[PDB]
Amino acid sequence: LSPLILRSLAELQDGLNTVVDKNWRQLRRPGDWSLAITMEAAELLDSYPWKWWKNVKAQPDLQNVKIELTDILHFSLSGAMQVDLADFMFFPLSDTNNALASFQNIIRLASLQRFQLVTSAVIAAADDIGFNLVAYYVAKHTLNGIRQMKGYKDGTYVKVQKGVEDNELLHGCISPFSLDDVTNEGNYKTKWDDIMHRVYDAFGTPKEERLNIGHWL
Amino acid sequence: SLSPLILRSLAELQDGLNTVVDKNWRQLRRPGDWSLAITMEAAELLDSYPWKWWKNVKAQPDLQNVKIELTDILHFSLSGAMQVSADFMFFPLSDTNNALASFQNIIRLASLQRFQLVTSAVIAAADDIGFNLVAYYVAKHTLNGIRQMKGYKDGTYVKVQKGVEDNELLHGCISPFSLDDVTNEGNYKTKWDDIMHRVYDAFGTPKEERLNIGHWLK
Ligand SMILES: O=c1ccn([C@H]2C[C@H](O)[C@@H](COP(=O)(O)NP(=O)(O)O)O2)c(=O)[nH]1
Ligand SMILES: O=c1ccn([C@H]2C[C@H](O)[C@@H](COP(=O)(O)NP(=O)(O)O)O2)c(=O)[nH]1
Ligand SMILES: [Ca+2]
Ligand SMILES: [Ca+2]
Ligand SMILES: [Ca+2]
Ligand SMILES: [Ca+2]
Ligand code: NA
Ligand code: NA
């Protein structure tokens, strides 16, 4: 990913973290981000049929893998703001052995606070798998804000409260967007705005509580 | 500090259970499999604390669940140590920040394949927290057997019943047993057998499908 796009992602990330807490930088510490990456990596690992004692014919939940890698990126962008890849990542990740090893290595890197390296690993993973990480990031960033608006912090929102996990709606919201659309330096901000409005529409956010791309960048 | 006789019998139960899962599990499994399993249980354990600063921030620790997850880690650290054949823990674990640091260190230890040291950590945690780890082990061991015979591998097992997960039924099963009851070197087997039968009663296992302590030890 280009330096411009990475910067814009990090700026979105700062903004989201601020919605969660003003003064997040004084409230948080690098070990919080390591723990967060660890827990998402566990969710990612749990998308594979790694259990030899349970549901042994299960297939990998490749749709969920996309969400979990996107969540890791939120937290590694965060950790980096408060602070070789071939030694850790093994391709192709469609091979379950490669995934389990590569994604357990994300936990070791998170524990060492190697956040920029985690970010590169996520980007490398999305490129190998062949999904649009940028588009997923913007979609899930928008959902993270909607969660905070609906009282996630206070316990008045839970992610499966309309009977379907909120994350699952994100695939449809990003379906029209190519890699080039969301990374083209002269037009990306409009595509990021389109993604935001598709997610707001998916969750019926009132027009008045919506934020445009210009609010974040 | 558990006695060598109790430690060995826990390990024999565990080998027993691993063999129900697969004959020749030692040839099928690798040390890294046990490392992964422990990592995943420790994530369950960390998630029993209110660590998330963005979600339901006034929540309290699920300290009953903590007991189950430590017990799960023990199954896997006993297994790891068999497969391979301080500065890590911060007490008290009643403090969230202590638990979060300690249990992330368990993940690192699991990754380093220091399985006997994970086992010691779990034993020390249970002493610190003050619950009967040996009784919980025998109880979950029984439920683990029940799962295997009620379709866990094939995907037909039903884990949650009207809101309540199988694991939650174990607490009532272990209530009547002290530490001395389940560790007395002359008598413990009979008490382990009583725990097994309470778990079977809780899950309504038909008598013909029950085992006794003697099907596992001797
Ligand atoms: O300070 C924070 C806290 C949370 N998140 C976001 C990142 C991630 O996308 C989401 C994870 O939320 P969750 O409550 O663990 N639920 P799920 O993993 O299903 O999205 O939280 C942030 O971006 N910054
Ligand atoms: O070869 C194995 C595989 C699994 N387990 C047991 C240990 C642990 O107690 C349980 C974990 O089962 P799970 O399917 O992860 N579910 P839960 O964590 O809710 O018990 O599986 C073993 O003892 N040996
Ligand atoms: Ca999560
Ligand atoms: Ca997630
Ligand atoms: Ca588990
Ligand atoms: Ca567990
Ligand atoms: Na998840
Ligand atoms: Na659990």
Based on the model shown, name its key terms.
homodimer; 217 residues; mainly alpha; all-alpha NTP pyrophosphatase fold; globular; binds 2'-deoxyuridine 5'-alpha,beta-imido-diphosphate; binds calcium ion; binds sodium ion; dUTP diphosphatase activity (chain B); Deoxyuridine triphosphatase, putative (chain B); metal ion binding (chain B); EC 3.6.1.23 (chain B)
What would you say about this model in short?
The first copy, chain A, has 217 residues and is mainly α. The first copy, chain A, has one domain: Orthogonal Bundle (all-alpha NTP pyrophosphatase fold), CATH 1.10.4010.10. In chain A, 63% of the residues lie in helices and 0% in strands.
Q: How does this structure look, described?
A:
Chain B: DUMP binds at residues 14, 18, 52-54, 72, 144, 147, 152, 159. 2 copies of one chain form a homodimer. The first copy, chain A, is mostly helical and 217 residues long. Chain A has one domain (1-217): all-alpha NTP pyrophosphatase fold. The first copy, chain A, is 63% helix and 0% strand. Chain A has 11 helices and no strands. In chain A, helix 1 runs parallel beside helix 7 (133-149) and helix 4 (62-82) runs antiparallel to helix 6. The A-B interface holds A 20-21, 27-28, 32, 34-35, 38-39, 42, 45-46, 50, 52-58, 100, 104, 107-108, 111, 148, 152-155 and B 21-22, 28-29, 33, 35-36, 39-40, 43, 46-47, 51, 53-59, 100, 104, 107-108, 111, 147-148, 152-155, 157. The site of one calcium ion (CA) has 4 residues of chain A, from helix 3.
